[model samples]
Target chain A: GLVPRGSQILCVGLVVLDVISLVDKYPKEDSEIRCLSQRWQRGGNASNSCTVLSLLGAPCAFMGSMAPGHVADFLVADFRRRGVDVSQVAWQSKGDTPSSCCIINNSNGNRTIVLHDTSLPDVSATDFEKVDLTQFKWIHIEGRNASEQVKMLQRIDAHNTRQPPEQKIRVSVEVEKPREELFQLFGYGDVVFVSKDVAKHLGFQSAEEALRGLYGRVRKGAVLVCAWAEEGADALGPDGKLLHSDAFPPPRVVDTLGAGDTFNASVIFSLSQGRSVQEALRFGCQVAGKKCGLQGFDGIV
Target chain B: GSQILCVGLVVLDVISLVDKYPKEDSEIRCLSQRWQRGGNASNSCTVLSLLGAPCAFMGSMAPGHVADFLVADFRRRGVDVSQVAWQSKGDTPSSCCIINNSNGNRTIVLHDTSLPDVSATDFEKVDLTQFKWIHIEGRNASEQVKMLQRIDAHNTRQPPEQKIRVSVEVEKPREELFQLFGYGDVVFVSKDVAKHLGFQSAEEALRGLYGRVRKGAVLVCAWAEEGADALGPDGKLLHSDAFPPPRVVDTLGAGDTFNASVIFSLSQGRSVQEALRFGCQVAGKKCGLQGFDGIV
Candidate 1:
């Protein structure tokens, strides 16, 4: 196995139940129309990455908080189907699970997402301690609950100081959301993934400019990544080196959902197996490119 | 209070809420979607029970989740379901798919076809003496006519003090409903039904239908915002002003609420005009709320 014995890659986030309805066109306000098709799918950032990671043959586990609603059983079953472990999730007693009503436009092949979330609490620092952190080889956390995320990072750093290099868990943070509170996540992760939206929100026009502006914000020994759609992806290495790759697009782009999650998972998978940062960047693009041509994340690797 | 019996179809409604109606061939997300129990008789039973009237619903139901939901909702609202006729086959009950725009306008498409309707044979089995008033939907006309004839026969055999009263609702503009005439002590007429009878307003419809309705029967025509006009058995005209709420939240079952309110008020011995005013006010209150729970 490429993964260290007895250790797993753990992804931390929320898993959303998506009720997707396929319609010919959006109906007028008062018109009654029948949807072409409908299905319930599992979706979300951190949870989707775990799906990719699990499919890529990585020993991946998922950690998050979930509610005990009627349909929430589907989320856990879906995670299991993708081979993602759910033993560490913080379970709530009462609340409906977060869900999205995704309407897929059949004409232009666009997705309109309308989300309804619950009042269930997130996995806080106190909840983090409930997990055996040493059992994880890598921990990827979504950029939410910044104060709690900082505590989690510090806890990992504290644990790192006592372990050998082989036993230490490398941390990665994804700052894809453009919220101001998520900026505190910049300096932490061993590898920080910055999205195009976050780059534009910070006034950076391209990947190079984004990495340069964010270079001083991260630890001097950490790598910074930016995945620009057609402009390709660029990374600023801890060794003061820049790595780049051209965008690898499929013949037809059927779906763009979870493409970013695939890229992030591939890069994390590549790096965990001791591949060079340059190799990781290209591998991320290849996996992400395969995702665009398919409807769901099946056989993408 | 004697039980008021409502006989009709109980439909399950799938109400989808969209921000703005989407253009054809384009997919859009919905704000929310929920299931509701619908149908004129079902809705009336809900309101009557909530307003402290002893009400019971007699409708045909198939064995399925939808039927279970309809029965559960009826039981929760304290509406009696002991008289429901269970279909030996066909699990899907009648249903309506509703699209609600942000403006509260609902466009509905009814789904089930060929479900068995309650007929005279089923009506004879129910204990008629328990009910003080029997309200019938003007559907399955021939069978309903037979059911009404039996009720007429049943009323004749009882003492005048114990005789059961009947009301009929003709909402759809169907010619078949015209056969339901002379059967009800009070025949509630919807705007569409009146318009189909060549009348421009409620008053005109009531005036035109004067002797055509029964010799001793009352014809009540409800015009949406114009209020309602009723021709009493003595050939006197009565009008009640419409009481529209400041904001209309939902207008789906307002007519059913109005009919239920009028029946309840009349049963309490309120004067004909007073009951008409109470019906309009209760129905207007229903428009301002989500469902029948708070209309009282």
Candidate 2:
């Protein structure tokens, strides 16, 4: 009885250049060491998720604020080749591009990330207005600057009010990091994705407990999912039913840098296709497992 | 009139510090990371500039931010990069690496798919008379030979007081590179390069090459930690002891520093033996510091 809306996803948040190196072990304080290999790749929560979404045949757009420099040039070029729409990206010329250096331990495939961001201006309300919310059916926002994220979610809420229920956009929020103001975003999202680290940071003992606690705080009909890394992931539906999926262990873990993003993207894509919570979690585990088996996200598709 | 000209490669270096080599099919974590400008000629020019020799660089670079970074780096080090040839399309040379432990042992992977090679045509654009000394890295030996011939012809046209002295860093052991050995007023070679030429030691290497060089040329062979040996054109053999650095932070640019310092000292009219000793000291000091920042 209702016309279908085409599949379009909008991912908004940080985009950074990731410089990664593989070494045997961490260096001693004030000591120099060597790496097995070094590489540079496009990395960020929203960027990584959108990349995976694009690879999964979902039409996705990335919106973020970045400086116009060599690093930005590299990012734009990579996004273009990956078929990720970046027309809504805000560019500032005065600041250094945001970047992160990840050091991966050879023995256990663990990573230590060091991030650096210049105090440059990010996307403002004017930039946000440039994106046509009507074109996208699903929006995922990364929790990073709580006040700014709230303003973005508020804009999406205002846009959804003008459309019918079936035509309204669904919003998903990735609350990986904890902030005092982030609690307000839980109600705004149709789905809330949380990590075990963030859950523990919020005083929860386990991911399942975190999911149960988060389920009550979100809007009615909203879902809460928590990823526990190697242990697995679980989701709590608005009906108060719990669904869990075991993690798919990879043959060898090369780098776990973008595993969470890959998991989030797969879950979002599966659920948006009318899949069950268990089915979504299973697909997410498979995708994240495959991602972990590779060096970078270059050929994961 | 005492300007020094360094001609060679300029590559972008992506350096990472790791603990130890990773086993097969395993991942690793690096200690630190850095991106810097590197190349034998570029390193030499930086030291020449630091030594107050009005140095200029001549090389080919692609037109992009990488090239911009290299040019900016040269400018910051007070090296004149106005003579660099910028191609409209091509990749700047790049070397990715991993250095280990306190010894600074490194494993490098270099890529130069589109690094434009400087040719004799590039040399023609500059006024050769402005330089009192010219140091050429032995790369693209054929093109460099043509450039050297042109420089020699240009020098012959100048008055004796204004003649330019030519030097060649024949580190590569290609037979074509040997064509440049006879053209230099000063010729520099490393012990490894000499051994590749079938010599047993630096002394034997210098002795073997003495007959092939110009009558007044200075021949020097660097033996790493063992120091350096030189044979003046008059057949006087000299050996200079290496300066034991307090610490060895990096050995990447040591040879380049030695070459540049030797050229600087020799052009300043220092004795052949003194120039060798001065070169060893400068290179040793360079090895004590990381990168080329403290070369002066």
Candidate 3:
């Protein structure tokens, strides 16, 4: 079994502050609704995935650039308190941090997310050089800023070539967004997790189709996983075999926040522990199902 | 030659306009919404500022975007926020949900996370000589008492012309706040708060506060739509009929409007009766407006 405390994963991507308002319903045009509850929490795909990874007892470090503000301070403090190393995170003196307001419907559990499109500079080579990549056994990068991600992958590739096979670090990339450039970065990931939304965007109708469509797109001997909401998840092994796991349905679904991140983290953790592709897929689906029964990712540990 | 200083909580209010309340386990759409800076003392100061009374606010706020939003609002409205106690880091004071139904009734749900209370030390930053009146929202009873005591002691040493009048708004009548009455030269209360303290009517509430208030002080109670009643320290009573607005849009900050106007009028050396009438007119005008802004 892999030593959970001894393993370290590096998560590189955007870190956003989410201001969530729980409303009874979405308002009509020019209509207003009272919030039953409002709160601020750390958000962003990689940030949430890393939070789950750290909570599950894996030592994790986040590599990203955050805008300079108290909002960014909140994110940094939360990551530090949760045992995620944030020393490698860059603080941009200019530009505002990306924030989103999530209006969640209390009745139907639907969420309307309004993201503040803040175009901030991506993580540069100077920021990446600060991290000791050799110390991390796994690195997960969100599929954003394609050119920057390619640069990071090149650095890791160079590092891997000089190290022994046992000391080489494995990379996983989450390509959930339907960005055209994101598809080009797939070959760099040893384990590629494609979201159902992106799968549909790419003309695949089902999780099985997504896995089959994504088979030759990733690196040779790389595993491909497709996360299908409610239909559960499916995986394609490097040897061309397909596996499926039924989604676990909790007695009641309290919140669906961070469900995808929880699934990704579970697969990454299980695979890092040398679990079989089928076991990892099943664990990811089961963890994501269990996560739906709780609010936020705090209950995952 | 009088400036007003308001001390109390400052909170962000998220107001939502809905057709009706949602049923149990059901959803309802809203009609409109807005985010406004709200608080008892903050609202009073905004009114004071609009009434052309140079006013400064003294309260505690966390240093963050929420505080930035509040401070910016105050500054834009020409209310001085220099004396505000900005803590290094913490959550802002609190937030409130104002649900406005079609009937013009507002149901407020307040989340008070207990921001650090403004203590006597926080008040020391204010240059006492600049203001002619200091109005305090009756909260943090013991801490306020200590603050009032310090201001009273400071007044005793200054020349008579520099002596600042102190007013207290005891809208939420808890037994601990009774100590505040002795320090206020002018005390304001609402009809509900007076009844909460076991008084049956406004007259009874005024008579009840007679012995508790400082000797030669003024006590006033606002009865919504019925006008306001005032009791002078010398046992004289004055009543001002309410000015009926042309249309009642929202009556949320009517009390604050009345309180600020009365404080402003009285500090300008208006007689007790005239100040009471002026307060009624100002509050009536405010009630016609959608929110507490641009009322002079």
Candidate 4:
């Protein structure tokens, strides 16, 4: 129901090729085993979020550094197929795109991923400065290269400082990893998605504890959201009220690969459309729960 | 050098790089995976072309299953695949699934193609006079025998200077491949075949197999680290020390590389001793790299 017009949700991060192998069980070290099937897919945090946003009838674009080769060719094709624009991405002249070799255990729908990524350069603040901020309604930045990320968000801050609240570009940052450097990105986002792993690492036993502990770390007006896997989720809103959604598990979790990305993009969708924090968490959890039951996001609604 | 023709199955090699070999019935993360064109003939075709010898590969391929990648790889390597037979029924081409450990050891499992291997009927379509050398991967004796017979017939029809020289790599010990021995002008006997034939060393293998080949045919044997030994047309025996790299990073296509280097040297009119030396150097150099790349 949320079809963005001229304004698009812009996601910035890395996109790598994923070589997935399906097997009954994961093979142990120093032994040989056969895989039931093997295939390739496009995968990355910000890129995946853009895919979910585009599929959900939202206008979106992905901004990232892309290597020029067969791997990048596949990713570009997939992005265009999903109606996700990547014209703003930094195109590298030379170097092979990064790839991940993923082993999915069909027995329990769990996956172990090994990423073989190097050579390609990361997107920088100067690259983001080229983007026309006026075209983007919401800017979602995946947590990585925290040093350069600070400069990029600072550029956005400079742009939003002069604008009225209605015309200002809202920002959201994902803090999936508990790297100390990434904390510098907290005060920049209107919404910050914190991972349960990061929550527990900081000594928070539950999502509620994480929200309470992390609320002050973000900007004074920003909101904190955390999904605690089977524990559902918790959100601390700008209105000084905490909201909770019961864990919405699917009938059977078939593939949990991009479940988090689905949740993040779904909340972005709802919040961008003026949905309340309570409903955003509810919609995010509902979409994320339904995602685990399906193979891909196709027909998820 | 004369344009050489590599006749055999050209397969897709799906190589998975792992920190260590994977144990059965469990999960392990592969460090990387590479997709490349593989097979005895095409591998040699790769080496021959990289060595500056013009060459063409003749094989059958099924679509999809990385079949497109296989053809694209050949086109990029400058090996002719225009003569390859395309099968519409199968989605996958013949492939070799390989696992390379961090220490560089490799294990392979093969996937067969539903598309037929190169048969005698396909061999007859090639213009024999267009090539100066023909190397065959010894398999399917019935078809191989017919293909060799056709080469022999062409050799008889042409004058001595125009005669196409033939070589066969009898890589396995299957007795049926012994039929391939009758037709090779310079037959390459693998170490396994020599061991199966009860020869203890490379020299002994060449010496014993020398008597069994055609009257003037050359017999060559390569024993991993023992170096390579060859008996020339006039019963002249020569040996070249193995030029193995200081550290062997990969050895999967070393044998085919050796065969291609030997053919390239001989085609360029180099002496047998020099051919043996060049083959060892090229094959050993190939070992330092992952595949038949940057070898000249």
Chain B superposition TM-score per model: 0.94, 0.94, 0.93, 0.92
DockQ winner among the candidates?
4
Mind giving the per-residue lDDT tens digits that candidate 2 earns over B1-296? 65789999898776665565444334455555566788889989988988888999989988877888888899888888888887766677766555554665555545554556888898878887678889999988888888888887987887888889899998766787777778788999777678877898789999998887777888989988889999986777999999868766567778888999999999999988999999999999987876777676
Every candidate's CA RMSD:
6.3, 7.4, 9.0, 4.9
After superposing the true interface residues, what Cα RMSD does each candidate give?
5.3, 8.9, 9.5, 5.5
State, as a TM-score between 0 and 1, how close model 3 is to the true structure.
0.63
lDDT of 4 by residue, A67-165 (tens): 665567778998999999877889988555667666667887766655553557788888777877777889999998889988988998898899888
In candidate 2, position B222 carries an lDDT of: 92
lDDT of 3 by residue, B37-84 (tens): 888899998888888889988888888777888888999888888888
What are the per-residue Cα lDDT tens digits for candidate 2 across A240-280?
A: 88888888888888778789999999999998888888899
User: Per-residue CA lDDT of candidate 4, range B1-296, in tens?
Assistant: 25799988777665656566554434554555566778889899888888778899988777773677778888888997877767767555433243454445555444454567778888778777668998889878888799888888878887788888899889867888887887777889988789878989998888787767876788888887678888977777899998877776667778888999998898899988899888888888877777666765
Query: What is candidate 3's CA lDDT for residue B80?
Result: 84
**In every candidate, how many clashes are there?**
8, 11, 3, 9
Report how far off residue A42 is in candidate 2 (Å): 1.8
The DockQ-based order of candidates, best leading, equals 4, 1, 2, 3
Error of 4 at B103 (Å): 5.5
TM-score of chain A of each: 0.95, 0.89, 0.92, 0.92
| Each prediction's DockQ against the real complex | 0.17, 0.09, 0.06, 0.21
With a 3 Å backbone cut-off (N, CA, C), the pairs that clash in candidate 3 are A31-B31, A32-B31, A32-B32
lDDT of each: 0.81, 0.80, 0.79, 0.80
